[PDB]
Amino acid sequence: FTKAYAFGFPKIGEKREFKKALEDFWKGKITEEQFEEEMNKLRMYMVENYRKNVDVIPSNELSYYDFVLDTAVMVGAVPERFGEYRGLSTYFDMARGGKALEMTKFFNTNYHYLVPEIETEEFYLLENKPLEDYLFFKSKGIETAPWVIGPFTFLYLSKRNGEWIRRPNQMEKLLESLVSVYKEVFEKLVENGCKEILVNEPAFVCDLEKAHWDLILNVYRELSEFPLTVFTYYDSVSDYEACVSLPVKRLHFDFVSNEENLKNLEKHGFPEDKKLVAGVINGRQPWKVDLRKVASLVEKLGASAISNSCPLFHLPVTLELENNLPGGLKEKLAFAKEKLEELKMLKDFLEGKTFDLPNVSFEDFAVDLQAVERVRNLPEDSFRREKEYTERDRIQRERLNLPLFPTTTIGSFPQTPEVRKMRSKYRKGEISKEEYEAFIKEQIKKAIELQEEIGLDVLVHGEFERTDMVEFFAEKLNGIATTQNGWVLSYGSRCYRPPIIYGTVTRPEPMTLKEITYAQSLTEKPVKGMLTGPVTIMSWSYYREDIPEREIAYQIALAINEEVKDLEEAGIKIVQIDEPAFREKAPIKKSKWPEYFEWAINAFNLAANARPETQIHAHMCYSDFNEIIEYIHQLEFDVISIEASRSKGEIISAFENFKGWIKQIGVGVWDIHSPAVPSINEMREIVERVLRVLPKELIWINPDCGLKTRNWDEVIPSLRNMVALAKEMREKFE
Ligand SMILES: OC[C@@H](O)[C@@H](O)CO
């Protein structure tokens, strides 16, 4: 007998019933009772999928917005600004709106959770959702195992007075209080017949201190009387011996995202007093795997149970209807539903109920050797630009002829309903390619003339022809496919369809030349080429695992550099490369950052390997650069734009303290997440702060980030104020 587990199955539904329910309810289209009924249908669909494939059925997974927020509500962590917790009304206020909790990435994934704000030192059982869901399924004659976020990870993902609660001394006191509530929840479950509880502790894979583990041991000793099964994923646990010594009867390890868990288990063994649950089916990638190979790992480990490595919600629901993928790709893929079926196959095989498993091997599939070696024989010169910054700077400035404190923007422009409809009609084939392009040309012209009128120094074409930055390029690159319904939850009701890098990546034709060249033909002002970095493209896409990550990254980077070269040839003087994944794609373990940044840096530089006369702008809307400034410094950009409104310019500290910093900085002086129009005085405070140490010639003035989420009536007046401010600064520091 091989007990099979599974967790994190997508909640959105095959027809995206979840997204529609949430949105209809918010718009007032349906009632709370109707919203609930729809959610229960999804609940049944989920456990139905589980029941057909695995032995242990999870419950408490259908979150109405975020499971971390659900955990906070469970323990009473509701900020005072929300008043008494009413229910859904309060829940969504904490989730979205002007008073909502901060939203941030869940570990190193594309799912975003809500950051609990701990205002009190005493937790209490506000709502027992785990019990609620457990009883709901029991009433349907279905035994389930509540899926909950463990107490250590919960605090680890939370903040107290604006700071993370991550040091042992910051966690210790709160934990005793927190575990007491968990104890109450667990006791009630057991009293009601609950046989197993799935506790998620992914924080165990962070670079923890031995002091953290001392705290964790004490936490679980207090919960040793409950039927707990602890899961860890996204990487190897930070202290194997300490982890396996925890007083829990069942322990799960992710044997997919890392090799350390296995090596450590082979070297130190695994306790006889507890059972191992082998996470052997990947939840982060959509590739079919040779179940005979997986089977051998499980057999060597003598593991009594199996399951996916990490939550399945990082994958789309089903591959079933994906019948328009490039030839041969569909047969090598497997989404959430198929991953569950793989666990069933593995279970049956391991129990001798079957003696055969489908063969899986496609190493040569979609592999373009000529392009591969083009990257494998990479000579240093493709990673370092011809001349050093100081020399390039001299050449660029004489070429650009820009004033002190030049102004520009750094992203998309707002998209009217008309722009959206045209893109729609185009995708549906309602209109021709020539027709769509003509429309785009019109929007670009209007945008260019508007910037001219407003008085900006460096212009952008608006990107009215793009929706998702990564999808835009994925559709133009060979080796990358896009799905029709491969939806994956990002947060709340927001879903995205990750592209699939299934083979060697190359750029067959120019991807952005027509729009950029056209925009530039309308003005004497320099117009920016706008591209997305290599690491960002793969960060938002699924990709082959039988090739090192850095190779895929360099392949993409080379393709991007070809675009850069075509832009240069076309006379484009400035090229911006947005690489938000530079930090966002970094390992959860900062101890693994050296190896990661080595190639992330090389990938960007390969993509940005432009002629000395070509000004390269790197763009990243990070809230702080203190922990990565040393890596940033190795990127061969000429200008780097940052968001400085939130910190009122204090984010500049990482730059003024970097000895030898001499590159230009595009200072964001306007928060594009607010409809409010920044006053000239507000922006002035920011620029003045930035000018405290750094020389004035390094500074550019621009908005914080893209503008596509704002309306024109907000953008125009803010842009004019930005120009007015820059003009003022020039007179002052003339
Ligand atoms: O160390 C992991 C931390 O930086 C966050 O990604 C957790 O969500």
Numbering used by the authors: 0 to 733
From the paper:
Cobalamin-independent methionine synthase (MetE) catalyzes the transfer of a methyl group from methyltetrahydrofolate to L-homocysteine (Hcy) without using an intermediate methyl carrier. Crystallographic analyses of MetE from T. maritima reveal an unusual dual-barrel structure in which the active site lies between the tops of the two (βα)8 barrels. The fold of the N-terminal barrel confirms that it has evolved from the C-terminal polypeptide by gene duplication; comparisons of the barrels provide an intriguing example of homologous domain evolution in which binding sites are obliterated. The C-terminal barrel incorporates the zinc ion that binds and activates Hcy.
Comparison of the substrate-free structure with the Hcy binary complex shows how the DMV region moves toward the zinc center when Hcy binds. In the absence of substrates, Trp539 can adopt another conformation that would overlap the binding site for the pterin ring.
